[PDB]
Amino acid sequence: EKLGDISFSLRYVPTAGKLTVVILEAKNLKKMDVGGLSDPYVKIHLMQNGKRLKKKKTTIKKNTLNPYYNESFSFEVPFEQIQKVQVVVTVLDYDKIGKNDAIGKVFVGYNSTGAELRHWSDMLANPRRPIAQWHTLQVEEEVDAMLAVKK
Ligand SMILES: [Pb+2]
């Protein structure tokens, strides 16, 4: 079962230790509501060794599997710590009643792999420039597992 794909940009300013993630849009998201579609919003957690340093979240787009956001978020990450953090991006379904269930999840950062690592590395090699990339969303539990694997 495909969960969907998320587009975001990454920008790192080395002198200011400023990390900017713009949630651009998502597409082909999993349908999460019986009798409807999904009500997606996107969480961003800045992590460091299990602990969460800071959280952000988009607005909610109701009744769509293909939401457009273009919402920007900045994080203070000093130069010396930028290869020690994880930027965890989660698409969830909003429900007025009950816990919001995650659709899928991905993380970028040094410990990441494949296209996630490539996005992260292209950001670091191209300072002050926003790099946009698509990511396939994965099962929350699998991502949570890999976040424990240090390089
Ligand atoms: Pb819902």
In this structure, what CATH number is given to the domain that contains residue 109?
Answer: 2.60.40.150
DSSP class of residue 128 equals T
Distance from C-alpha of 38 to C-alpha of 103, rounded to nearest angstrom: 9
- Technique used: X-ray
Distance in Å, CA 62 to ligand 1 centroid: 8
Consult the annotation and say whether 144 binds a ligand: no
**Token couple for 67:** 């939401």
Range of the domain at 81: 1-151
> Is residue 95 annotated as involved in ligand binding?
yes
* β-bridge pairing 102-109 and 86-93: antiparallel
The 3-class secondary structure across 100-112, one letter per residue, is CCEEEEEEEECCC
Residue 50 Cα to ligand 1 midpoint, Å, equals 28
Data resolution in angstroms: 1.8
Q: Is 33 annotated as a binding residue?
A: yes
Closest CA to 138 of 106, 99, 92: 106
Q: Which two tokens stand for residue 57?
A: 């979240």
Residue 114 burial (10 A CB sphere; 0-12, 13-18, 19+): exposed
What's the token pair of residue 93?
Answer: 């379904």
- Within 10 angstroms of residue 61's Cβ, the number of other Cβ atoms is 19
Please give the tally of structural domains in the chain. 1
Please report, as a single letter, which amino acid is at residue 45: H
